């Protein structure tokens, strides 16, 4: 059987074009916002499995202290 | 050799001229060479011969060439990727255009050449063979565009010759006859060309812009865009615009993109058209809706078009149309944000800049979508870069003679411009350095530093009472090149800052404000700068005050005294908050405040009534006391005392882990998971001698205490708020797992939820599984089966031993079982998995009928036999027959799990 691409139907019929004008709700969407608050913005920055497994659960503001934790991060 | 010359070649006009050369010699051999070119460009390997040419019609040729196509794959030249094929396509198109343009004065009107080519392309464009329909359509589209040029030239020639005629009708009769004759000949030429376009348009475009294949619809819409931009007088009317109007509603992004690119070409660079504005006003609604197209690439163009539409009129758009576009400045996607931002600029941005700065504040305040300016600002960064870096201006409005809602918003905006200028990247989610950019950066920092070193102390003074404003203003010094405090001879202002910061710390109890103060004092206390020593004194002095205040409060507070009431507590808490925040960022060991904190935590247990907020902050505070002492580690008299405090603090955190207060449980839990990791076995790992004495391994009791918490507080049934807290707690526990501070068998109670909580916790549980596979392939697969075991026993306790294997509960475990199988040393594991699943299946026997039981686990275990393995399958079966007997093997009727498991082995 030929690997050549042959189309059974070459054209969209006129009726479905009429329908496409009538309803485009499936090719439109809602607005996807960036983080709307400082807290949510910081979360997105510091979220994800990677960042989570590599930082303390009680945040440490000083690198002197943060290292004490990250020091212990490979078995 | 045409096809090969166009792909392999040499200039296009060179081979066109060579072809025109041969067409003059012998039309027929040359046209045949042209026929074949179009065929072979479609990937076809057939050849049309002279005998076919002279005798067969196109329908018969095309059929013969479908037969002789001789393809290997479904590939054809216009769909294969790589640069050599991209170059082919453009060569293919250049040649057609250049062929027609080079024939437009003689050959093109010879009644032979074009009808042949058009007939063939019209037939091929009708073929069901896609390689023909696709290639020939592209050809015919380029062919048409070449003809629009010819028509345009003709029109120009017709106008010149007309002006020549009239100038002579004035003024002789012999030249007039020639100009009349010339004018007659050109009109014939126009009719002939319009025929050819009308053939191609109705024969190809009208059917093929509507093709089932999207790539072919896009081809057609691209060129109709080109004709209208090229010969607008003749093509820029509704009779051609309507096609682009309909196709804007196409179901594919690539098609919709071309409709918008086409229309953009009809505004940029040049205007203005009454017929275009009518169409646009007629399709305006559908255009603004495309600013939220499912495909972002389409959405950008939709806004960019709306920006062009703005230039011509602003009549067509409504307030609601524009307001919708404004929202997109807060879009997650930067190209949309920036495009929407340029729209915002041209619409509403036209003390020179003070009115533009005030303008931006009103816009930001009218936005009910964002409560901070980080993303509004980034969207404006490309176009209003001058307005946004006008810090001198912005600084003036806040000081020197409006409403306090506008003052906070201006402070907000100001801080965003500064951060994005200081650090050179967009805010998170907007990301994706050069020579000249670091220059602007360095320029930006020094301008910021020099201005705000002087202005910030005045700014804090004015707005100190407001928590939101102060938290913002305090982020500033973290963006200074601090050198400038020395070389700029600005130390008088630095002292003013340290004074205003100090006053804020003492009048504020809000957690964020104090975090800002602490984080700021840390930035200034960098010891790579001459300034350190000045600040260190003020730090060392502020805290002397806090510790002494704290000790005295804690004297009246611990005894009977009176009461201590709600008021005496807020006194302690407030002061404790200030101390805790600073101990995080700053080493305060020189004040031994473990004593004050321990006395405050142990007293909380005995009395049983200690306000939540004090307990929380003590727990935090002594966490930092411990951690800081561990930072400076010789002596060994200090080292033995560290374990003293540490062992004790873990016990306190363990007691508060069952505290009736929920946010208190959580606080105690997260600190615990932190210390356990810090004082884990890994403490000594980093070339450490003196860190082997401090190592802590939790009791089996505590290990279960930490799990009980997770099950209660992470696994049950705004709210994005609540979830973030729980993911954080879960990862705190999973770190203990993947770094083996806690037994891996605890993960069984976690792995079984990978499904039931797949959207809340899926990725965290998925990583815990991987970091245990990469750590120990065998015991991973062990606890991994113990998970399915634990789900199994839960079904039993809730229903008994009748299951109903068709049920949703049982089907659910089987589904989780399949996904566990895809997680597969390499094969000694699955061996070990089937062994325990078999051991468990025959764990408990049946008392009666017949002396079943737990046997249903094999239909779950059957989900893993798919994976491995022929040799090992024998080994598994051999291990299975140690459990099953002959009259077990032989009867088949309910005993179906066992048979099913056996077929797969």
Curated annotation (Swiss-Prot), chain A:
Subcellular location: Cytoplasm, Cytosol; Nucleus
Positions of region (Interaction with WAPL and PDS5B): 1-75
Region of interest (Interaction with STAG1), residue spans: 42-75
Modified residues annotated as Phosphothreonine in this record: 74
Function recorded in the entry: May promote apoptosis.
Name under which the protein is recorded: 64-kDa C-terminal product
Record organism: Homo sapiens (Human)
Shown residues within the full chain: 321 to 395 of 631
From Swiss-Prot, chain B:
GO cellular component: chromatin; chromosome; chromosome, centromeric region; cohesin complex; cytosol; fibrillar center; membrane; mitotic cohesin complex
Subcellular location: Nucleus; Chromosome; Chromosome, Centromere
Positions of modified residues (N6-acetyllysine): 492
Maturation and modification: Phosphorylated by PLK1. The large dissociation of cohesin from chromosome arms during prophase is partly due to its phosphorylation.
GO terms, molecular function: chromatin binding
Functional description taken from the UniProt entry: Component of cohesin complex, a complex required for the cohesion of sister chromatids after DNA replication. The cohesin complex apparently forms a large proteinaceous ring within which sister chromatids can be trapped. At anaphase, the complex is cleaved and dissociates from chromatin, allowing sister chromatids to segregate. The cohesin complex may also play a role in spindle pole assembly during mitosis.
Family membership: Belongs to the SCC3 family.
Quaternary organization: Interacts directly with RAD21 in cohesin complex. Cohesin complexes are composed of a heterodimer between a SMC1 protein (SMC1A or SMC1B) and SMC3, which are attached via their hinge domain, and RAD21 which link them at their heads, and one STAG protein (STAG1, STAG2 or STAG3). In cohesin complexes, STAG2 is mutually exclusive with STAG1 and STAG3.
Disease affiliated with this protein: Mullegama-Klein-Martinez syndrome: An X-linked neurodevelopmental disorder with variable features including intellectual deficiency, microcephaly, microtia, hearing loss, developmental delay, dysmorphic features, language delay, congenital heart defect, and clinodactyly of the 5th finger.
Stated name of the protein: Cohesin subunit SA-2
Upper classification of the organism: Eukaryota, Metazoa, Chordata, Craniata, Vertebrata
Whole-protein coverage range: 83 to 1048 of 1231
